[PDB]
Design a protein around this ligand. Structure first.
Ligand SMILES: *[C@@H]1O[C@H](CO)[C@@H](O)[C@H](O)[C@H]1NC(C)=O
Lengths: 46, 49
């Protein structure tokens, strides 16, 4: 019943492929919802 | 829906009571509403509990 979020931003100047390197993820907010989640869709500004 | 009117000269029983019931819902989600928590002063160099 908890929704964990982790985020990390890296300042690496690689063009396209996923960088070959190691970097951890820190927790942002562990908030309760208590509701099942089954689908996912993203939003981009237009 | 009949009228519910009052005057200050009304006696006990006819005096209106403002009633609030603090009901609650539990056991269907992780607990989110709790009470206050005690805070005490820390102690150094003495083995405490
Ligand atoms: C989540 O799924 C369970 C599976 O049985 C169901 O009982 C429950 O009602 C569902 N809750 C929500 C918020 O979808």
């Amino acid at each position: 019943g908890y929704f964990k979020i982790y985020s990390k931003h890296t300042p690496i100047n690689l063009v396209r492929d996923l960088p070959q390197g190691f970097s951890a993820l820190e927790p942002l907010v562990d908030l309760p919802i208590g509701i099942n989640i089954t689908r996912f869709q993203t939003l981009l500004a237009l | 829906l009949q009228s519910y009117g009052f005057q200050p000269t009304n006696g006990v029983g006819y005096q209106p009571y403002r009633v609030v019931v603090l009901s609650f819902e539990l056991l269907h989600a992780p607990a989110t509403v709790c009470g206050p928590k005690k805070s005490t002063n820390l102690v150094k160099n003495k083995c405490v509990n």
